Design an enzyme around this catalytic site. Structure first.
Site, PDB file in Angstrom:
ATOM      1  N   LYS A 167       0.891  -1.169   0.000  1.00 23.14           N
ATOM      2  CA  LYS A 167       0.000   0.000   0.000  1.00 23.14           C
ATOM      3  C   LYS A 167       0.925   1.214   0.000  1.00 23.14           C
ATOM      4  O   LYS A 167       2.061   1.091   0.452  1.00 23.14           O
ATOM      5  CB  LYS A 167      -0.888   0.011   1.256  1.00 23.14           C
ATOM      6  CG  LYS A 167      -1.772  -1.218   1.472  1.00 23.14           C
ATOM      7  CD  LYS A 167      -2.941  -1.258   0.489  1.00 23.14           C
ATOM      8  CE  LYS A 167      -3.649  -2.578   0.590  1.00 23.14           C
ATOM      9  NZ  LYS A 167      -4.660  -2.739  -0.452  1.00 23.14           N
ATOM     10  N   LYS A 193       2.159  -9.066  -2.128  1.00 24.79           N
ATOM     11  CA  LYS A 193       1.437  -9.066  -3.405  1.00 24.79           C
ATOM     12  C   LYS A 193       1.253  -7.682  -4.013  1.00 24.79           C
ATOM     13  O   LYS A 193       1.175  -6.685  -3.279  1.00 24.79           O
ATOM     14  CB  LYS A 193       0.074  -9.753  -3.257  1.00 24.79           C
ATOM     15  CG  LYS A 193      -0.997  -8.984  -2.504  1.00 24.79           C
ATOM     16  CD  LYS A 193      -2.281  -9.846  -2.324  1.00 24.79           C
ATOM     17  CE  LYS A 193      -3.148  -9.889  -3.591  1.00 24.79           C
ATOM     18  NZ  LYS A 193      -3.582  -8.515  -3.973  1.00 24.79           N
ATOM     19  N   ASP A 195      -1.259  -5.090  -5.439  1.00 27.69           N
ATOM     20  CA  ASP A 195      -2.690  -4.844  -5.350  1.00 27.69           C
ATOM     21  C   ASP A 195      -3.370  -5.277  -6.646  1.00 27.69           C
ATOM     22  O   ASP A 195      -2.747  -5.278  -7.733  1.00 27.69           O
ATOM     23  CB  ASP A 195      -2.974  -3.371  -5.052  1.00 27.69           C
ATOM     24  CG  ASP A 195      -3.826  -3.196  -3.789  1.00 27.69           C
ATOM     25  OD1 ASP A 195      -4.867  -3.890  -3.659  1.00 27.69           O
ATOM     26  OD2 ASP A 195      -3.428  -2.402  -2.900  1.00 27.69           O
ATOM     27  N   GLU A 196      -4.641  -5.645  -6.546  1.00 26.68           N
ATOM     28  CA  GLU A 196      -5.367  -6.135  -7.721  1.00 26.68           C
ATOM     29  C   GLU A 196      -5.309  -5.180  -8.917  1.00 26.68           C
ATOM     30  O   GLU A 196      -5.332  -5.620 -10.063  1.00 26.68           O
ATOM     31  CB  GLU A 196      -6.813  -6.524  -7.374  1.00 26.68           C
ATOM     32  CG  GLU A 196      -7.785  -5.358  -7.081  1.00 26.68           C
ATOM     33  CD  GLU A 196      -7.537  -4.688  -5.738  1.00 26.68           C
ATOM     34  OE1 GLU A 196      -7.098  -5.350  -4.758  1.00 26.68           O
ATOM     35  OE2 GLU A 196      -7.778  -3.479  -5.668  1.00 26.68           O
ATOM     36  N   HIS A 286      -7.098 -13.434  -7.594  1.00 26.74           N
ATOM     37  CA  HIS A 286      -7.860 -12.361  -6.968  1.00 26.74           C
ATOM     38  C   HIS A 286      -9.258 -12.313  -7.586  1.00 26.74           C
ATOM     39  O   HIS A 286      -9.422 -12.458  -8.810  1.00 26.74           O
ATOM     40  CB  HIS A 286      -7.122 -11.024  -7.148  1.00 26.74           C
ATOM     41  CG  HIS A 286      -7.636  -9.929  -6.268  1.00 26.74           C
ATOM     42  ND1 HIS A 286      -8.731  -9.164  -6.598  1.00 26.74           N
ATOM     43  CD2 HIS A 286      -7.219  -9.484  -5.061  1.00 26.74           C
ATOM     44  CE1 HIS A 286      -8.960  -8.284  -5.641  1.00 26.74           C
ATOM     45  NE2 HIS A 286      -8.061  -8.464  -4.690  1.00 26.74           N
ATOM     46  N   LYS A 326     -13.256  -6.026   6.713  1.00 29.79           N
ATOM     47  CA  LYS A 326     -13.977  -4.872   6.193  1.00 29.79           C
ATOM     48  C   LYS A 326     -14.966  -5.231   5.078  1.00 29.79           C
ATOM     49  O   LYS A 326     -15.824  -4.411   4.702  1.00 29.79           O
ATOM     50  CB  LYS A 326     -12.968  -3.796   5.726  1.00 29.79           C
ATOM     51  CG  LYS A 326     -12.163  -4.158   4.480  1.00 29.79           C
ATOM     52  CD  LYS A 326     -11.065  -3.156   4.151  1.00 29.79           C
ATOM     53  CE  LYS A 326     -10.385  -3.546   2.834  1.00 29.79           C
ATOM     54  NZ  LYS A 326      -9.095  -2.817   2.576  1.00 29.79           N
TER      55      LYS A 326
HETATM   56  O1  LIG Z   1      -7.465  -4.041  -2.019  1.00 32.44           O
HETATM   57  C1  LIG Z   1      -7.653  -4.443  -0.840  1.00 32.44           C
HETATM   58  O2  LIG Z   1      -8.423  -3.803  -0.072  1.00 32.44           O
HETATM   59  C2  LIG Z   1      -6.938  -5.697  -0.376  1.00 32.44           C
HETATM   60  O3  LIG Z   1      -5.612  -5.633  -0.965  1.00 32.44           O
HETATM   61  C3  LIG Z   1      -6.857  -5.726   1.153  1.00 32.44           C
HETATM   62  O4  LIG Z   1      -6.100  -4.641   1.671  1.00 32.44           O
HETATM   63  P1  LIG Z   1      -5.943  -4.497   3.265  1.00 32.44           P
HETATM   64  O5  LIG Z   1      -5.292  -5.733   3.830  1.00 32.44           O
HETATM   65  O6  LIG Z   1      -5.033  -3.329   3.547  1.00 32.44           O
HETATM   66  O7  LIG Z   1      -7.304  -4.344   3.870  1.00 32.44           O
HETATM   67  C4  LIG Z   1      -7.582  -6.971  -0.943  1.00 32.44           C
HETATM   68  O8  LIG Z   1      -7.477  -6.947  -2.353  1.00 32.44           O
HETATM   69  C5  LIG Z   1      -9.037  -7.199  -0.515  1.00 32.44           C
HETATM   70  O9  LIG Z   1      -8.988  -7.952   0.679  1.00 32.44           O
HETATM   71  C6  LIG Z   1      -9.841  -8.000  -1.531  1.00 32.44           C
HETATM   72  O10 LIG Z   1     -11.080  -8.358  -0.954  1.00 32.44           O
HETATM   73  P2  LIG Z   1     -11.550  -9.895  -0.944  1.00 32.44           P
HETATM   74  O11 LIG Z   1     -10.518 -10.769  -0.276  1.00 32.44           O
HETATM   75  O12 LIG Z   1     -12.849  -9.969  -0.184  1.00 32.44           O
HETATM   76  O13 LIG Z   1     -11.793 -10.360  -2.362  1.00 32.44           O
HETATM   77 MG   LIG Z   2      -6.073  -5.282  -3.044  1.00 32.08          MG
END
Ligand SMILES: O=C(O)[C@@](O)(COP(=O)(O)O)[C@H](O)[C@H](O)COP(=O)(O)O
Ligand SMILES: [Mg+2]
Ligand SMILES: O=C(O)[C@@](O)(COP(=O)(O)O)[C@H](O)[C@H](O)COP(=O)(O)O
Ligand SMILES: O=C(O)[C@@](O)(COP(=O)(O)O)[C@H](O)[C@H](O)COP(=O)(O)O
Ligand SMILES: [Mg+2]
Ligand SMILES: [Mg+2]
Ligand SMILES: [Mg+2]
Lengths: 467, 140, 465, 356, 230
Positions: A167, A193, A195-196, A286, A326
């Site tokens: 992040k 990782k 981020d998506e 993801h 969250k």
């Molecule tokens: O983009 C985000 O918010 C995260 O990188 C979490 O960041 P944090 O750890 O800082 O919260 C993940 O991609 C989400 O958890 C995806 O949701 P899910 O697993 O429900 O598909």
């Molecule tokens: Mg993410």
């Protein structure tokens, strides 16, 4: 004369509602939660869904007589009223295995969810479950490696895996990315990782990132003596770009890449999965975009189906939800599809949203990934819910530590190992969870610093996707 | 703010971030193996063969993804198939560390239904190892 | 300002009501339904944050970069008239956030995670403003409307097509037989059903070959250019390309792809292949209604339509308004303009939240298909005008006399309506008269008129403005 | 030669006993990728038979456990281990995972022992393209040896594989799976000697020859006959060994016989006496069935082989003194003694079907 | 004390003869006509065939314990005496679908007929039939076209197809081959063919043949108005 061609419209139920049909063990079965328009009988609505997702259209066609509609038609074989609902029904449909292209999740989806959701004659439709028969399962390459093989390649046993998303989501340079990666990995995380939505952008181009990340991976691995990896995002605008990114990862000799399978798509994902099998890369999946499809109870496709679809298409990990974080994920619903992701054989269990007994016929299991809004105090609950066969990811829970990434990583690792040890010694994490964490914050300064910052932080809201 | 040290701070996977296991703690982990019907086994390695390395990759084309030397250690005797006695496991730990007092030794256990190692942790490190920190010297 | 660990409100960083949007920003209109006790401002700020740069707690790494430069910004929140707990939140995204040329990336940011947040009950993406500076990074449609008409030598009326039925179960030879009889009777195109790919009952390459024979026979017989949308949709990009390549080698005009079930990554690849090889690309929107049907949650079709124009397609299914599948009139006229036009001004009575400038990117031909027949023709011609394709599956293969008379019936109907409109007749008022005069003249048309006279699809609309 | 004639109504049975392949036809074949001399040279292994072992159970082991078993076998004194003939790529273990874990095991054993090690990775596959993919991965891992099932894969695929091996420097171990469907009965089929000649032309560095003394059939005189046909440059007509024609190989490399199946430490003298040094002796159950595990099992077979080789070199007659050599060796070596005790009474003595 | 590793030889029938086994619908089934040696019970012989075509060998191995033999083993589940025979039995064997490589007939043959026919403990063995379950059939590409599609591509219906192999088997030149082909095809045959042993030989190289045959095929097709092939 016998049965000839008679032009015109007739009810779908005359052909496609077959309540006496005994399903075959090779049939694909679908469970639709169906809300008919007023004045549309449930039987006709179920028959319409069956028809328009298999062989039928709105008026009679002469060409049916050239083939055998009995052999090919979808069949609404059962209609169940929904308790607590005035105008909702579970309609059960059987599809002959002959309808489907072997090895294609794309084609399965095109038939079963292609057009029926937009029919004027229904107000809402939701696909709750699919029974994929072994005969169809066997036509898929499936996951490149799966849980056992992944653990064997990484030489990691006896606990959950730990990870972290770097992040801020966007805006870091390739060099700063690798810097953050190295500090996370060196502190005790197994993986970091992309981020998506980190693909290739003006602030950071992909190949610069892959190189700096490889440097970071190898530095942490040399420093800690443990195998490390970072899910480099191969998600791209075209198959050719995606493959370019995977090839670079192969050439750097790094262990693992990622793909956003819904926004990239099943056709690209299956191709990437086959590439990973042939070149020995782990594939982290993801589920970006899933909640657009799977949030609402009345309309869409439940995640358990999108999870089954992924297991067929190919993936070593899939994001599973945290329950306590969250993002939404009800406990019983989650335990159900985690079993569908990991196990070889799952029996029908409606209290966990499993509408069909599912036999995976030895297709490898997918590692569930718990991620989003989680921190150290969530650890006991996570280990209790998921057990050892899961990866637990802490983006903010690592990069938000007051002392930086390495202490952040060590706090998370200490928490995980303390809970795992406590469970192994016969302690109940569902109840002694806070005690385990408190004894651990008292022993570890890193963990204590994390405990203090996030002590009051909880995510408790009314659940939308209820059973 | 404390700083996690990058110098001589090598780890050993599961439980290596916790205080070293007492004999009572080791016994508890063994009880957990036996209670679950898993197959106990001991593995060992000399110091030079203990950590993951890359030396074989010199022979490779572009196929080094997820290849590492030193993942395999050496098996102490055979896995203890059918063992339901925790004391028997503890006796083998003693026998193994006695035979190889200068080796790294880990206890693992197998699940034959999943066909995977289901647990594992270090039970001995050589007394000459200088590449690790005690819990309280991990940060400065 | 130093690093302070911990959780703070999203609105402190991501709610910026005094922000003046840049002409290069990507804009998003979210219809948002907060949980009780969550302020609209905090909910909109959370959507802006988690779809751009932010997470749930403060990270130190923000300080290494410039959050002002990169952050998404909720810059306006509109209350929804008629709703107690619905808001339109407007978010602005710096162009720097996005991979050039990648619809996949744009979706991953804007609709990636935010729909699953516990803090909201429902979320719908209503519209996106794609600025010229981002549009230009996309190859876009392989050809577009003008080029397609020019290659086909077809002008002055809607195109006519037909999906072969039954959907599944016909052999390759029977498939080509049905195709030949449709094309020869007056249809421009026929098509593989969306779910016809390669199956035990009919393998794709057998189909392609028999269909090519049928196209060429019908073209020689009629003297008009013919085609058949051969489905390249497949399980893998490699299979998809193999099918595209066979079409190329047969010299046939057009293939099709299911862009949502195949995916944006495969679709963009296919569109570039078509551009470089001169194939027309028909896009089927299979699965869209899973996403776009409900008013409270999902992504409106107009956004899925914009995404396709960027990704690439020469045709896109648009709905019929009057057929078996849902599509409100004003909503449909809205996104049809978004699909075809260079410049579409903001118009909330048609669901257009943003002025859209396509900067010369080619327009996509709308395809009206599903539960339509001869009596719908005046309404179809009136809604769509000439630049559409009108498809009749059941409406051709359900004709009492077979495919060729069914094709001729639909062609007569379309030409009668076109002529009547060109003569100044109002199809909204005189449509029935035009059809009746034509059923009296043409026996093929009369036979179709008789069979489907009473058939209408009139139901309460779910996706209302 | 065998295409249609065996199905003629006018005959009750037909068996092809032998073929005389003339030098002029022999010379049209690429033949074995390496052959015995070259194999020994590349492996740096001289003055004794080679020792190997098939991993067991045949099927059901994961890729990780496969490599674990391989590493323990190789570190104890075996030159080679091998994939079972039916281990290709299966739900319990995909080929590329196995190849990778086996490479690790090979290199670990080689580092630990100081001797060159290999494991015959099975390239046998459903299609030529898949077979090639597997060969290419072995090449890229820098390992010494692959295997093929030449009768179930087929001659066309085998010849292709042999040519690949010649051009890339891989040794090629041939398994003869399915041969006994064709060659068991005296009245009808094709004799193994013809199948063995075919393989030498098609290409292979090793070919399974039978054991004489093990669980599978192979008469002594018959076996000695075709072993010469596999190994030698020139073999004269000799009907007492089933050789119907004088065979001139015109310098085509010789194929290493592999004795495998139901053999253990007590067979060692008889095996060394029948085959001599230019053979590979394989012990699957005879290694993985040792009471102390694979490494002690491997050490037991290696001790037995070396003791027999030494005795023969000293002038002892293994046909007469074989038991004495083994007993002296079980007394000296605890690993060997444990093997000697378990399999002491185990023999395979049955009426022979394929008689001359 | 549970089940441990016991080294040594035991009867195959202790593990591989399972007469109360209920076959699964995904099992591959084999019917073997089996002739045991004197002094070998049919049950032991059937068990040996099941073992050595699946997971087993001649002595107990310790590695069994790392996996689940119950899950993977072949099972002799039925033995039928042959009427008219003193020493022949039909032994029925079930194989878990997990044993087989998807899409590979080679692999199926390697397990089922790989080694068992050479066992000293039997005098003769014949594989009579195999039950291929749909779940395994579905893993194969199978025939490129099949009967319906073939007939549709050739536009030939209502009768058997007619063909002919060119003779003499070997010794004809490429030109004489096409001349013979043309004269056959023009007279009413749908197909002609290369003899099975006609590949590429000193008297006629393949590519020369393919060209002259193509000429012949197209001449007969033009002459008769019927689709021809060779
Ligand atoms: O983009 C985000 O918010 C995260 O990188 C979490 O960041 P944090 O750890 O800082 O919260 C993940 O991609 C989400 O958890 C995806 O949701 P899910 O697993 O429900 O598909
Ligand atoms: Mg993410
Ligand atoms: O499968 C079908 O139902 C159709 O072939 C129409 O058949 P008929 O012409 O026989 O009705 C079309 O694919 C749908 O119209 C798609 O809907 P949309 O265009 O809304 O995406
Ligand atoms: O599968 C088996 O049975 C073996 O691995 C032997 O195992 P064991 O060493 O455990 O007996 C061999 O493949 C056979 O010897 C082949 O027979 P042959 O060499 O006659 O072709
Ligand atoms: Mg359709
Ligand atoms: Mg074998
Ligand atoms: Mg012939």
């Amino acid at each position: 004369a016998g049965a000839g061609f008679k032009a015109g419209v007739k009810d779908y139920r005359l052909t496609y509602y077959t309540p006496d049909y005994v399903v075959r063990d090779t049939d694909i079965l679908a469970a639709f939660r169906m809300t008919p328009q007023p004045g549309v009988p449930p039987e006709e609505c179920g028959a319409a869904v069956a028809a328009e997702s298999s062989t039928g259209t709105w008026t009679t066609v002469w060409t049916d007589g050239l083939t055998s509609l009995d052999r090919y038609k979808g069949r609404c074989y059962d209609i169940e009223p929904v308790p607590g609902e005035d105008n909702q029904y579970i309609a059960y449909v059987a599809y002959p295995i002959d309808l489907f292209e072997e090895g294609s999740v794309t084609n399965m989806f095109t038939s079963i969810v292609g057009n029926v959701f937009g029919f004027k004659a229904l107000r809402a439709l939701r696909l709750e479950d699919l029974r994929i028969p072994p005969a169809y399962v066997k036509t898929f390459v499936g996951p490149p490696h799966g849980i056992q093989v992944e653990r064997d390649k990484l030489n990691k046993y006896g606990r959950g895996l730990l990870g972290s998303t770097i992040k801020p989501k966007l805006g870091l340079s390739a060099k700063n990315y690798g810097r953050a990666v190295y500090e996370c990995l060196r502190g005790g995380l197994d993986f970091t990782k992309d981020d998506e939505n980190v693909n290739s952008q003006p602030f950071m181009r992909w190949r610069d990132r892959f190189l700096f990340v490889a440097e970071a991976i190898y530095k942490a691995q040399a420093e800690t003596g443990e195998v490390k990896g970072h899910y480099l995002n191969a998600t791209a605008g075209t198959c050719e770009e995606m493959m370019k990114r995977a090839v670079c990862a192969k050439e750097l000799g790094v262990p693992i890449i990622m793909h956003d399978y819904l926004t990239g798509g099943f056709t690209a994902n299956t191709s990437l999965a086959i590439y990973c099998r042939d070149n020995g890369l782990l594939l982290h999946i993801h589920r970006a975009m899933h909640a657009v499809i799977d949030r609402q109870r009345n309309h869409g496709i439940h995640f358990r189906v999108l999870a089954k679809a992924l297991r067929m298409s190919g993936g070593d990990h899939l994001h599973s939800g945290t329950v306590v974080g969250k993002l939404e994920g009800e406990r019983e619903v989650t335990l159900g599809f985690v079993d569908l992701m990991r196990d070889d054989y799952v029996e029908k269990d409606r209290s966990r949203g499993i509408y069909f007994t599912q036999d995976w016929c030895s297709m490898p299991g997918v590692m569930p990934v718990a991620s989003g809004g989680i921190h150290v105090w969530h650890m006991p609950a996570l280990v209790e819910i998921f057990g050892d066969d899961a990866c637990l990811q802490f983006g903010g829970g690592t990069l938000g530590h007051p002392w930086g990434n390495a202490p952040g990583a060590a706090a998370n690792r200490v928490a995980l190992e303390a809970c795992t040890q406590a469970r192994n010694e016969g302690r109940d994490l569902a109840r002694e969870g806070g005690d385990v964490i408190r004894s651990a914050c008292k022993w570890s300064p890193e963990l204590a610093a994390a405990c203090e910052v996030w002590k009051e932080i909880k995510f408790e809201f009314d659940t939308i996707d209820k059973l | 703010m404390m700083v996690w040290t990058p110098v001589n701070n090598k780890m050993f996977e599961t439980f290596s971030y916790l205080p070293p296991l007492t004999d009572e703690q080791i016994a508890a982990q063994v009880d957990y193996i036996v209670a679950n019907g898993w197959i106990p086994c001991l593995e060992f390695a000399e110091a030079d063969k203990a950590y993951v390395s890359n030396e074989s990759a010199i022979r490779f084309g572009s196929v080094s993804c997820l290849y590492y030397d030193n993942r395999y250690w050496t098996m102490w005797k055979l896995p203890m198939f059918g063992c339901r006695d925790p004391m028997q496991v503890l006796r083998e730990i003693v026998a193994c560390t006695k035979a190889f007092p200068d080796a790294y030794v880990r206890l693992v256990a197998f699940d034959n239904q999943k066909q995977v190692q289901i647990m594992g942790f270090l039970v001995q490190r050589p007394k000459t190892a200088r590449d690790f920190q005690p819990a309280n010297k991990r940060s400065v």
